[PDB]
Amino acid sequence: WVIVVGVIGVIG
């Protein structure tokens, strides 16, 4: 949430 995968704690 929302798009890319990875990036400091972000999930989908």
Side-chain angles (χ1 to χ4, degrees):
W1 204 93
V2 186
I3 293 169
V4 180
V5 171
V7 193
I8 188 54
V10 177
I11 320 180

Short mmCIF file of all heavy atoms in Angstrom, two decimals:
data_model
loop_
_atom_site.label_atom_id
_atom_site.label_comp_id
_atom_site.label_asym_id
_atom_site.label_seq_id
_atom_site.Cartn_x
_atom_site.Cartn_y
_atom_site.Cartn_z
N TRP A 1 0.84 -1.22 0.00
CA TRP A 1 0.00 0.00 0.00
C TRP A 1 0.87 1.28 0.00
O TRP A 1 1.38 1.62 1.05
CB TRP A 1 -1.02 -0.03 1.17
CG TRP A 1 -2.25 0.81 0.98
CD1 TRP A 1 -3.43 0.37 0.47
CD2 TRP A 1 -2.46 2.22 1.29
NE1 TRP A 1 -4.33 1.40 0.44
CE2 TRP A 1 -3.80 2.57 0.93
CE3 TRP A 1 -1.65 3.24 1.84
CZ2 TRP A 1 -4.31 3.87 1.09
CZ3 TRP A 1 -2.15 4.55 2.01
CH2 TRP A 1 -3.48 4.87 1.63
N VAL A 2 1.12 2.07 -1.13
CA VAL A 2 0.62 1.83 -2.53
C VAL A 2 1.72 1.77 -3.64
O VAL A 2 2.30 2.78 -4.03
CB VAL A 2 -0.49 2.86 -2.95
CG1 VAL A 2 -1.11 2.53 -4.33
CG2 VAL A 2 -1.62 2.98 -1.90
N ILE A 3 1.99 0.54 -4.14
CA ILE A 3 2.83 0.21 -5.31
C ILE A 3 4.36 0.43 -5.10
O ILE A 3 4.73 1.35 -4.39
CB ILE A 3 2.25 0.89 -6.59
CG1 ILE A 3 0.88 0.27 -6.94
CG2 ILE A 3 3.16 0.86 -7.84
CD1 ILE A 3 0.09 1.02 -8.02
N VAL A 4 5.32 -0.40 -5.69
CA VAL A 4 6.83 -0.36 -5.52
C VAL A 4 7.40 -1.57 -4.71
O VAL A 4 8.25 -2.27 -5.24
CB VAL A 4 7.51 1.01 -5.22
CG1 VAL A 4 9.05 0.87 -5.06
CG2 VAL A 4 7.22 2.04 -6.34
N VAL A 5 7.00 -1.89 -3.41
CA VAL A 5 7.49 -3.05 -2.59
C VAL A 5 8.87 -2.73 -1.92
O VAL A 5 9.83 -2.36 -2.58
CB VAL A 5 7.39 -4.43 -3.32
CG1 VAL A 5 8.09 -5.57 -2.55
CG2 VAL A 5 5.92 -4.82 -3.58
N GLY A 6 9.06 -2.86 -0.55
CA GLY A 6 10.25 -2.26 0.13
C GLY A 6 10.05 -0.79 0.61
O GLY A 6 8.97 -0.40 1.02
N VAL A 7 11.09 0.13 0.58
CA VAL A 7 10.92 1.58 0.95
C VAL A 7 10.51 1.84 2.44
O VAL A 7 9.37 2.14 2.77
CB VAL A 7 9.98 2.33 -0.06
CG1 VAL A 7 10.07 3.87 0.14
CG2 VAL A 7 10.27 1.99 -1.54
N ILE A 8 11.46 1.74 3.47
CA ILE A 8 11.22 2.10 4.92
C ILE A 8 9.82 1.80 5.55
O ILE A 8 8.99 2.67 5.82
CB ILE A 8 11.77 3.54 5.22
CG1 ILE A 8 11.76 3.93 6.72
CG2 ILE A 8 11.09 4.65 4.38
CD1 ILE A 8 12.47 2.93 7.66
N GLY A 9 9.45 0.49 5.84
CA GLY A 9 8.18 0.15 6.57
C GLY A 9 6.88 0.04 5.74
O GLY A 9 5.87 -0.47 6.22
N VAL A 10 6.88 0.53 4.50
CA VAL A 10 5.73 0.46 3.57
C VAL A 10 5.46 -1.00 3.15
O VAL A 10 6.38 -1.67 2.72
CB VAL A 10 5.96 1.37 2.35
CG1 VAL A 10 4.82 1.29 1.32
CG2 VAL A 10 6.08 2.84 2.77
N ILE A 11 4.20 -1.58 3.22
CA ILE A 11 3.94 -2.99 2.74
C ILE A 11 2.81 -3.10 1.66
O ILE A 11 1.64 -3.27 1.93
CB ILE A 11 3.78 -4.04 3.88
CG1 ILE A 11 4.77 -3.82 5.05
CG2 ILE A 11 3.95 -5.45 3.25
CD1 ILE A 11 4.65 -4.84 6.21
N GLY A 12 3.13 -3.01 0.31
CA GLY A 12 2.16 -3.12 -0.83
C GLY A 12 1.29 -1.86 -1.08
O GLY A 12 1.04 -1.47 -2.22
#
